[PDB]
Symmetry: D3
Subunit: 328 residues, 6 copies
Amino acid sequence: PKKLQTDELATVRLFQENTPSVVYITNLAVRQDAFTLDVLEVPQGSGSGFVWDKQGHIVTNYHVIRGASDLRVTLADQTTFDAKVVGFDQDKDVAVLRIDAPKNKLRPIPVGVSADLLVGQKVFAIGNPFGLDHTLTTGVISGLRREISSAATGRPIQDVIQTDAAINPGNSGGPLLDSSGTLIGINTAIYSPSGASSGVGFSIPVDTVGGIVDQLVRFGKVTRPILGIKFAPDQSVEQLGVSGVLVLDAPPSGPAGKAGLQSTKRDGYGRLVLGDIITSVNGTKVSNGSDLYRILDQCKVGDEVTVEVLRGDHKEKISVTLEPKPDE
Amino acid sequence: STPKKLQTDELATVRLFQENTPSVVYITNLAVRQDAFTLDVLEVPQGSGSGFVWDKQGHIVTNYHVIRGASDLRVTLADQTTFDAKVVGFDQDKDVAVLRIDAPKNKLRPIPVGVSADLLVGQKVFAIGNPFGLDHTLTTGVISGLRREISSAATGRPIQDVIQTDAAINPGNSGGPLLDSSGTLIGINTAIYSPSGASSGVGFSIPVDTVGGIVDQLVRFGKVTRPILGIKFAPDQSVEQLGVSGVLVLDAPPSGPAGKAGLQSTKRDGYGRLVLGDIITSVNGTKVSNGSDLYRILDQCKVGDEVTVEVLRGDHKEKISVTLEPKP
Amino acid sequence: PKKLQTDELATVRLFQENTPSVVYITNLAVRQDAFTLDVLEVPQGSGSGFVWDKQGHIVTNYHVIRGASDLRVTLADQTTFDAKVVGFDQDKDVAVLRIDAPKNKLRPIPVGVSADLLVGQKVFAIGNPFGLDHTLTTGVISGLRREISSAATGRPIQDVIQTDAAINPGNSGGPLLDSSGTLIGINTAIYSPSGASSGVGFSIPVDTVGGIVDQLVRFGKVTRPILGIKFAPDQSVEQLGVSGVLVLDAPPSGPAGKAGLQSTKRDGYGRLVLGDIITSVNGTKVSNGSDLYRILDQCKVGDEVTVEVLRGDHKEKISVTLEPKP
Amino acid sequence: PKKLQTDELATVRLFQENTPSVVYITNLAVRQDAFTLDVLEVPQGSGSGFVWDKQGHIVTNYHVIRGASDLRVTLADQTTFDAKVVGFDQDKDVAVLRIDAPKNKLRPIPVGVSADLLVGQKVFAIGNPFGLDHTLTTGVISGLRREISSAATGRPIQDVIQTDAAINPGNSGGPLLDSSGTLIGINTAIYSPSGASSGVGFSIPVDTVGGIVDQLVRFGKVTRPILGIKFAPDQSVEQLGVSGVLVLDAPPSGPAGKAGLQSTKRDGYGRLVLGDIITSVNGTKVSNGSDLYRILDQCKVGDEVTVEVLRGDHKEKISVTLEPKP
Amino acid sequence: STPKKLQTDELATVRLFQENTPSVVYITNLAVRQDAFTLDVLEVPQGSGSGFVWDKQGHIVTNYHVIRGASDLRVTLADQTTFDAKVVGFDQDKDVAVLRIDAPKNKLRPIPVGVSADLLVGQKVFAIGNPFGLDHTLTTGVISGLRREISSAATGRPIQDVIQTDAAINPGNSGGPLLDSSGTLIGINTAIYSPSGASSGVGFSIPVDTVGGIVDQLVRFGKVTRPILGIKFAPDQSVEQLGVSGVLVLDAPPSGPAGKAGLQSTKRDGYGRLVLGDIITSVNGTKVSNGSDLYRILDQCKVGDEVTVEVLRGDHKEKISVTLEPKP
Amino acid sequence: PKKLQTDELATVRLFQENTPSVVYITNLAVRQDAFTLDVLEVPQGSGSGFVWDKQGHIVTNYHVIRGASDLRVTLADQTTFDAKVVGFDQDKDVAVLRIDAPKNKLRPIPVGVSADLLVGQKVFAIGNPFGLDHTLTTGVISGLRREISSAATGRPIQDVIQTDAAINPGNSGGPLLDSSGTLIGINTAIYSPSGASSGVGFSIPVDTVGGIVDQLVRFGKVTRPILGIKFAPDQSVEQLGVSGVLVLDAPPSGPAGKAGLQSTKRDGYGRLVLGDIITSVNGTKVSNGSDLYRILDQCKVGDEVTVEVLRGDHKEKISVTLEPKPDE
């Protein structure tokens, strides 16, 4: 060994201390034997995750787990285990797994704080892009409080972290650490016309992660509020000079339904009779989908939200009490 | 929660960013369009980019390709307030443009002006812009190369002295600042080399030394006056067949510097046969093998100069004097 | 400058001091003038490399040189020289060149050590991406001991260094240096759906390069041990369904054949007379080839190694002595 | 007209007389209004067919009907009717429909004979290519007894008539008539790299259609003999290298299993325990399936047929009795 | 060698061809272009097509899409002599055009004019043209269908009464004759339906009955006068969203027939909201479900006619009289 | 059987009488055994041919035979034979094969005459498109005396027959018969943007075929004259107002070489010194490649052709005696 400089030494260390907490995740799919006609389990995906606690809980992106007839997590030392799906939140693309492993081979990553992050501080991403086990890439926090389309549901994910640390396919589910060797986010997606890292990557912030992992380990589900309306996307509403959100449907069996919000119908000659248009929700104004989403993201089941609509050419105000989203 | 002590290196990048992001702006290129349903005149964004604040008088600098073809321009300040921007002037060849905003002198932080002539490969650089609409994104890198010549199809005419960096630069970054570790402007990010159209680690910035000169001239006279030889010539991969080792002058307007001086254009003998004209083979002693060489030479010239251009005419060369004049 | 930081100052110095050792390599092909139709030489591709010693030996990837009528290397001061091929190793994509030039123009690149590298340390890549003469990109060692498929032709390369320092077409053959300004690897390939840099580049370790250059300089080729076996790909060992490397042909001359390995055959009808199937080599369990290769990749010509095959519903152990390919 | 020629005059008459029997078939799917989001029915595809009898039975290709919420047939006079599916045979892409309409609006198409057809005779195709209501194209019988892969799903169709009368998407289900103005086949598919007509269209022979319509009308399905075997494709019987149809699974219930055919298996390790392999069925030599299929395609449920397999370096002959698929 | 006795059927097709090929011509569409080397004005073919001789006065008929955008036209007679052609006039809607040639009256064989109204499906047809430049190619087929309506993007406005044939028709055939077995003009080949852009057995011809009328009018007055309602309407797949069961009139110029009569255009209430206008639902009693229906209706109308158009306006229909005027 | 009409009966008959003369040809290529590592013969192409004589000679397109490690011809009754390549002419894409077969299973097609063909007479094509054995397609002669690019060499093939009888991949090498049940051409290519029959197909005329088959059976080669010059293609000569054919090279060892025609060279400064330009060849004028080709197509080895060139701005006349093209 040669004498390494301060800085690089700090990252060399940070990596050795934390790589043990990172794991490889395999999404095995069912395939047929061309002759045996029976089945064989065979990898259709690769991703990462980290150890959350001594009880064998593993965190990752839900999109990495989606559709796996079976999934196995490989730990640092290469010992591979079978994993049970503890639970998951599709909106924030967070998922929790559990494995039966000896507490000695489990390092839970030190949990940090994402609320105090500053653009410019250094970050460290560890994951498995292209199957390269426990790859380290470094960069900087490029941005904070970003909103990105979930695609895991389409619903927007608020408060996302942006980094220019190389993030490629296979990094999803792995950790983003700060200079303190602390977890600040889960690497989950990128913006790139090629599908290759283009220097713009996103991580779900640790703060929203920790809450979700708690709820997931306790109840195996996260309960989120709904208004009970299907609205028109910002696009197919563009050509109507529509200020806010056009409710297309408010099922009689949901919150806005029981609260009497009107849906969009048809003239009898076939013309469109616009349903209510949400222009504001208790205080905060709503000009499009993101605004609505963002605002409800702050509510909890049971809250009595006061929503303002633009009904037949005259304003309105309606109180709706948010109920949990129907299960399945 | 209290922030964690950051290392000195990263802490610096954090200061540089707090200090300069406010000087960065977002620019919107609007163009007139037909309303689909009421067939009226509508204003609609067709592209966006970056820029920075130059003086307390409201002068915004950006790339020309950003404001090009614009019907109307809006610049949005860091604090999200937006102003209408007037085109002070621009230099299509060096892809630089100045805009004027009527905003409060306190909402305007001129960017520290640096020096590009003494930069060294390996120096740390900082890019701030709006790649993919991501507001004031900070990406970090190093100076990868100096004195690069990139042929910007955004004029055609090549550009030289350009800075090369491996800080991530993506669509949306054009027009934003490139800072040195001292937090001073050293270039304006304008293009990249990429098969994908996305950052691949090879980005270019027009050097501050070139920009200072141009902004100065645009503010003071509304234009940049550049000399011309007054000829239209055959692009390289067009005469590469004939073995032409220079610029095959296609047209020397009798009205321009080269025509009034006697250069002979290409011509057909009515018999169909192509009787080519003068072939420039050097100007002020500098060899001219391709159109770029000619360009580079003129780059270093001033209007009113008496350049001596050599030409291969009818089996012998011969030097002719041409007096460069301003572009009309 | 306006007072550089210590860290950036170190980069500045490192580039300043080593860019002289890097070179530009232009691979010229023979073409035909389209009007006169006389033959002429024109560039087929370009890459980089670096100076190895005061004798004028230049190192780069073999894939930079493959299929080139003539080779020309341009030194940092723009002066060019015709280049002779001293030798090259296809399996490790390393090639040595020799140019005839002024000893005061050759700065041998300081040679480092790759066995001690640690993930996270700073690296420096110098090369000519996109024709961008002596570009410097910077990153960290992202992974060590990686195994990437023959970035030239076939056999897996072992011990590959992974880095997120921007590496692009044109960087092939150039040096990857550590913070001590020493050669730790040769930038040679990348993983990318775009074909350009996306953060994962690989470079062959200097330790491996040191050896091969040395050999090439002296014997103009490097001797490698061979088993004397031809086998089926990991994808053809699937449907048949078994862990191991199936022997498809053991030339009676090639060691494995001397020893008694049986090749695959076709019975009177047409079905498969399943020749041997290697499942272990003197210890290590083989099962695909990345294995058989990986392991065998550490033997020397001569090393009598025991190979565990399988044939009659029973396993067996044959003793084979390694020889070199001719 | 200005005095038509006898030949064109015959075409004119033939179309004039039979276009009444052709119909338009629109396949409607369930969709969602994008603003009101109530469900609605909208066209998924269209095809043609023809009237079979005064009861309102309509004949077309099953592939014209597959996956349709509701079926509507439009008669030559533009009047439409909802259609009920009477039955259909997937292997011969034939389907019967029944509509409720005026007997004075149904012209049963004169039914011809396909067994006597000769290459070179004139044919007449009527259908709705590209929505072109009752288009008439003309050509000759280009080939007889052709075998084209299941223009619906799987099994080869036999006895297919080939023609160069322009056949395009939309013609599927329509009649192909001979010069006697009689039904000789159902236009069902084409060979084309463009996806549109290039001169080789195929239509299932009326003899085959006559039978299936009849069956469907009565039992609402047609019974077919099955061997009770699952086998590998002609492309997986390649690498192993042997003429024959390899048995991959003989369900102990399915006749072949009752008889004692052994399926392919995997030995303790993972290699292939090569189950049986059919090389002949009571006479005809099988070797791919187009064969096994072709042959077996002429048996009736019950027909005890001897099948020649192969297992222990020797051939053997098992007696199997055909049953129908449930 | 002596020719072999041909069958009567084929012998006829051989006569029909000997007799008519001389009346067929080749047409060249030349356009002005920049000479690459001497940057001068050059004449250069950009497309070719077919046509036929109409009278001894040198009138050539062809499709309009063939001569469209032409800078200069040359027609080549069967005997390979070529003449410059002047545009007599054309009807963009029925894609028909007449040209005039100054050639010797003996080199001109007018084509026999037939009748298209009494054609029958199954009749034998003969097409002569220049597919892919193949001089006076003869292709044979049958009349496949009558009264077809094809929407020629070569105007947009649909065309009706069109003949469908399975005689091979390929690029290069446009503008050439379609003959019946009596050797008389019955249509002019103009388009085909094909995924490949090449004959797939579905070709269309504009019927002779429509052509006779148009050529006549073009020769006599240089133009075809067609009526207008004076409205610009919303294309179908544009309002299909609103449930509009007719033509949603977007604009009724106050200067035109529909405006002077009172039809109301679509409009936004400055509040952004899209307040749509009249929706035509029938004209002279004929239902109007889509733009084509309206087109077809007007097709059968004459200028100066007082058409009564029904409109869905503010919850009720109401018939309004409009007096059709000539196209400007 | 039903009573068939005159016409169809004639074709039914023609087909049964001649289908026996048609054969299927298989182009087997060498492929490896993934395990055996030895070789297997495996079809890479399919085409047709017909029996030329009782001695087992089979005719086909050369392009069908090109590159076959082995080729086998299947006769009517399905008996497949191994075939020896008697010889071939690449210019006219004609090839002759020989097989060892019992004279009783060999019907040589009746040879007709192509010189008297008339556009409009009926034709019958028999071949194997898409592997459909002995497919019959009928149509008409659409054109005569056409010139098409050989692609088998690029050299143009003169005097080609055009038919609208469906001709697809797999028809090459099969016969085109006239109503007399006589061979009038070999189906060999088509014009189609899809690769599927588009109604424009070509056959090499029987007259030129018969000569070539004779020479091929006698000497196994056809001897064709050459001028001994490589010229510039009509394209890369376009921009030079070049009237005729620009000779690029006239090797000193060939006819025009020994006769002293000049090649194109380079100025010494790199400019182009045009070699001779052929404007005429003994009588007939030459304006481009096709003209030259076409004209030499009429000469025989040994002919002393007088060629006119445009040398350095003054005309010329040079006698060249054509020599056989060097073998290989």
